[PDB]
Design a binder for this molecule. Sequence first.
Ligand SMILES: Nc1nc2c(ncn2[C@@H]2O[C@H](COP(=O)(O)OP(=O)(O)NP(=O)(O)O)[C@@H](O)[C@H]2O)c(=O)[nH]1
Ligand SMILES: [Mg+2]
Length: 177
Amino acid sequence: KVLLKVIILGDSGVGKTSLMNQYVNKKFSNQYKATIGADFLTKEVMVDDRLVTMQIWDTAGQERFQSLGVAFYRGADCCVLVFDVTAPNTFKTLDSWRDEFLIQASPRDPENFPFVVLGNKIDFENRQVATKRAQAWCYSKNNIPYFETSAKEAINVEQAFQTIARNALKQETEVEL
Ligand SMILES: Nc1nc2c(ncn2[C@@H]2O[C@H](COP(=O)(O)OP(=O)(O)NP(=O)(O)O)[C@@H](O)[C@H]2O)c(=O)[nH]1
Ligand SMILES: [Mg+2]
């Protein structure tokens, strides 16, 4: 019985909120309800012989909803990085999201911290960002795992979150100290 904090970072419009309500509640909606502030949802899951409670913190990509020195980050056990395959700008921002996270949570051993990158929205056909340069990018950065997901049609949502889970748990375990 173990608690995992998991934070979902990335630009506004990538579908951070939609991946959440899909994974947790198996529901999808077209209605873009801009995420004000930062809340969470819990999903209970089984990872490797162990019941895990995953607290999933969904944040506001916009700077329209920033207050104001967000230290909700720390105690994080896995940071999830979401870009939109139809928008090259949301992929370019990933380092900046990754840097910002590491400043804020500043976990010890920062470069073994579990990141997961989700190429959301592959249910569309106008993908701009190939699988190949995002596969590269996740590899350039300590070989972090990468899925191409769709919250709408629910492709790789479950699979990806099994990895989010398992990696969150390894990291939690690493607090032997
Ligand atoms: N076709 C399709 N639309 C998606 C997908 N994921 C999200 N959307 C749509 O994209 C828009 C933005 O989604 P949203 O979840 O709000 O993204 P967000 O990153 O959480 N935005 P915010 O940071 O402002 O909450 C919404 O219209 C949403 O329904 C997807 O996989 N496929
Ligand atoms: Mg959101």
